[PDB]
Design a protein around this ligand. Structure first.
Ligand SMILES: *C(=O)CCCCCCCCCCCCC
Ligand SMILES: *C(=O)CCCCCCCCCCCCC
Ligand SMILES: *C(=O)CCCCCCCCCCCCC
Ligand SMILES: *C(=O)CCCCCCCCCCC[C@H](*)C
Ligand SMILES: *C(=O)CCCCCCCCCCC[C@H](*)C
Ligand SMILES: *C(=O)CCCCCCCCCCC[C@H](*)C
Ligand SMILES: [Cl-]
Ligand SMILES: [Cl-]
Ligand SMILES: [Zn+2]
Ligand SMILES: [Zn+2]
Lengths: 29, 21, 29, 21, 29, 21, 29, 29, 21, 29, 21, 21
């Protein structure tokens, strides 16, 4: 599905800004 | 998870911080 | 270094497309 | 790390796969 | 709501390109 | 405003320029 | 300077997420 | 229509990464 | 075309590569 | 050069907004 | 300005808040 | 090319139009 993929693209960008030096793991559904 | 919560409602910075390492 | 921060934002968006359903980990430090 | 390897030189699409889960 | 937030993200990027040196004020609903 | 107009229809560059300072 | 222009595009996207409903102003000059 | 425009924005970014030095032509509907 | 195929289903890297020069 | 690659990603997104229904071609080489 | 302060050095999330409305 | 002309100096919105179809 496309719109969930689009939301995920902005999601990882938000996580990159918020997490910073700590980093993050991104796991989709 | 993160898609379920934050793709149905706008997540604030604090909510986004929950998924950080 | 700001240039390092800008590069990381393109790295995470590249990982999101490349990995797909697998997901990715971003760990600078 | 990914920063020391992909921000100093361009990483191909296959090289980025090394950091997938 | 999420999809309006997603459209706003591309909206400010468009404004940054179009406005240039003049700048802009972004105010959501 | 800008969300109401440009998130329901595609705004051209001239329409986007209206919201500049 | 192109590098300045590229940095500003990441600044506006950062402001959009950070400020939220408050909105933001981008004024380089 | 807006949501197709939003998907196209992420589409050209994906094409830029995948195509690389070969380049691409983007033609909308 | 590319909007019809890849904005209704998630296109993989190989599918996206089809539209390259 | 990574900085060249980062700049190209902003060029394609700028072309997508500027050209609109006309579309664009991205040819670095 | 935001360019002279956040493009020469990395601005934290709190520093970016100084330019919110 | 667009890289040699728009990545070394900032290209205005009109200059980017030269690479439209
Ligand atoms: C955490 O700080 C990562 C450690 C390695 C960072 C290397 C950054 C090198 C400085 C940037 C050089 C290129 C600038 C255009
Ligand atoms: C308007 O032009 C803003 C005035 C201050 C601009 C400072 C830009 C400094 C040049 C960039 C240096 C870093 C390049 C990687
Ligand atoms: C294909 O490789 C394009 C040929 C011209 C490339 C010019 C790149 C110049 C190097 C970057 C200089 C600016 C770095 C901040
Ligand atoms: C991946 O298979 C997605 C799994 C979660 C289901 C998402 C869709 C749920 C119903 C949404 C309907 C709205 C779009 C027609
Ligand atoms: C913030 O509260 C949004 C206020 C504007 C309303 C947006 C939704 C209007 C109806 C859209 C329905 C389509 C999605 C189910
Ligand atoms: C440009 O005119 C778009 C042409 C393709 C039609 C897109 C819409 C098809 C029906 C989708 C309905 C879902 C949104 C209400
Ligand atoms: Cl950049
Ligand atoms: Cl979107
Ligand atoms: Zn960038
Ligand atoms: Zn989007």
């Amino acid at each position: 599905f496309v719109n969930q993929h689009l939301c995920g693209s902005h999601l990882v960008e938000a996580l990159y800004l918020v997490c910073g030096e700590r980093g993050f793991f991104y796991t989709p559904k | 998870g993160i898609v379920e919560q934050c793709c149905t409602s706008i997540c604030s910075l604090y909510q986004l911080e929950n998924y950080c390492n």
